[PDB]
Amino acid sequence: METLFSGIQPSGIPTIGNYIGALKQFVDVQNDYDCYFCIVDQHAITMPQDRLKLRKQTRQLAAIYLASGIDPDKATLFIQSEVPAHVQAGWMLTTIASVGELERMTQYEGIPAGLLTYPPLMAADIVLYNTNIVPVGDDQKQHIELTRNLVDRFNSRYNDVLVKPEIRMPKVGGRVMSLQDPTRKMSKSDDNAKNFISLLDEPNVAAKKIKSAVTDSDGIIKFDRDNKPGITNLISIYAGLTDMPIKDIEAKYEGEGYGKFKGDLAEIVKAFLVEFQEKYESFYNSDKLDDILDQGRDKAHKVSFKTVKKMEKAMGLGRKR
C-alpha cells in the first residue's frame, strides 16, 4: 500500500470546488492509500498570521476535513507543530540544502526568514512518512523537485533511509471554475465572492451565487466547455455534489432551460452545505475533535520518530543508545 501525504494550510476555508476537486476524492483514496493529512501550522507562520485567529483556523481545517469524510482510523490527521519530528528532520535537511537552492524557490521591515527556509521543512513533512505520492499542483513542482534532490543528497552523503516522492493525485476531481468567470479556477481568495462558494458560506448565499453565475440567458443543459463554459461549469458542480454522470444530468434536463436547471442545482448546493455544515459544527464544536487529533498526532509521531532517529544516526547527531 502506497503512502500519501498532503499538507493543509490552515489559512483559508476550502471552497466547494476544493471539495469536488480534492477533498471528496480523499474520502475514497484513504481506503487504498496510507494517507497523512497534516495541518501545517508551522508553515502557517512563515506568512503573517493573527496569533488568535491562527489557532482557530486550525480547528476549522481539521473539522472541514473530518466533515468531508476523512476517517481517523484510515488516514492520519494531525497538526504539524505537535509532531516534533517535522522541525527536527527539517533542520537536518536544511544543513544539506544550499542557499542558492532556497533562493531559487522564492522565484518560481524585512523579508521574513520563514519564507526562505520553509522548503526543507516541506521536504521533511513528506519524507518522515516515506511518502510515495504528494497530491499537489504546478506551483508545487519546484518544491517536490527539491525534496527529491534533498532525499538523493541525504541517501548519498549519509545512509540510504529516505524515500523520494512523486507528485500524484489518485482520483483526479472535476475542474470547478469561478461562478462569475468560468475561464479561471475557483479560488477561496477571490476579490469577487460571487465567484466562489465557501464550504462555510451561508447556504442561502451559496444558493444565490449559483443563481448569480454568469451564463447565457437560456440554453440547453449540455456540457460544452469550449463554447458554453458558463453552464458547463455549473453542470460540473452539479455532477460533483451529486455523483450523477454528466450525460445523465444532460439526460434529466433534456428540453429544460437554464432556469429550471439552475434552480435545481441551487437547491442541491444549499442542500449539501447543510449536510456538510451540520457535520462541521458537530466536529468543530466537539470534545471528540481533541481526541481525534490526539490519536492522529500519536500515529504520525510514531512513524516520523523512527524516520528522524534513522536520520540522526546517519549524520552523527545525538548518542548511540
Next chain:
Amino acid sequence: METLFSGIQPSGIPTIGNYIGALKQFVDVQNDYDCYFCIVDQHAITMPQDRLKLRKQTRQLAAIYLASGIDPDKATLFIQSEVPAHVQAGWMLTTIASVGELERMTQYEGIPAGLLTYPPLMAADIVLYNTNIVPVGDDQKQHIELTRNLVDRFNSRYNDVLVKPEIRMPKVGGRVMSLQDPTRKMSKSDDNAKNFISLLDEPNVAAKKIKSAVTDSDGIIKFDRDNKPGITNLISIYAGLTDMPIKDIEAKYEGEGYGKFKGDLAEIVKAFLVEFQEKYESFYNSDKLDDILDQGRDKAHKVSFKTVKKMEKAMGLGRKR
C-alpha cells in the same frame, strides 16, 4: 539565582588554555548560577562533519566537561538534538527574523544553508532556559545582539514570555597564549601544534611543549607581559594549573632561572593531564556517561518544554488543551 547557558561545539578538543580560561571557572560558578551546558550537535552539522567522527566527539566533549569537574546535579549537561525544544523554538524565532538579518551575521557545490540559518537556532538554545548570561567572546557579539532583538520582537508581536540575555562570564580566567607565539591566544586549531597543549595530548608531549615554548634564554621568573611575554605566559599556565598566586610563584622562583622553572611547570602540566585524562577515560569509557547525559537531557527538556509551549500559544501554533 541567575541562569547561565553555554553551548559547546563538539568539534575540537579544548586546549589547556581553554581549561584555565573557561572550564575551571565553570566548576566554581555552577554553585552560584543555574548553568546549562549544551553540546550543540545540531549546530555541529551546519559545518561539514564525518557522520561517524561526529557522534564520537560529542561523547568526548561531554567527558571533557565532566572530567573538568562539571557536576551533573548542579549544572545541566545535555546534547542539543535530544531536546526537541531547540529546533522547535528555533523555527519560531526564524519566522520573525529577517533575511537581511541572517545575511549580515555571515559578514561579521553551494553554501550550506545551516551556515545562514543557525542564528535563530542559537537564540533558541539560549532563551529556552530564560538565560540571563552567556559566557562568550567578541565574535559572538553579533549573535547575542540578534538574540536580544529576536526576544524583543517576540515579546512585542506576541505575549512577553522570553528573557533577553547578557554576555557575561562570572569569573574570568587567565589569558593563556600560544606557547611558541605568546602574542596570540592558544587555539586548538593551530597549524603549529607546539603552540597549544590539548587536554588530550600525550602528557609527555605536553611536557616537551612547555620546554619548547619560545622564551628568552634565561631570565628571572617575574611576570612582565609587555616585555617578557614568553616566560610571563608560562607563569600564567603554572598559576592556572596550580592556584598559586603569581606573586607566590615569583616568590618561589626568586633567584632561579628559566630552566629550573620550566622543568617544574613541565612536570606540573604532565602531572595535571594525567589527573584529568584518568578522569576523562573513566567517563568517556563508562556506562554512567549515558546515565548522566540522560539525566541532563530530561532536566533541560522539562525546562525548555514549558518555554516552547508558552511560545506556541503566543503565536497560535497547535491547539488549546
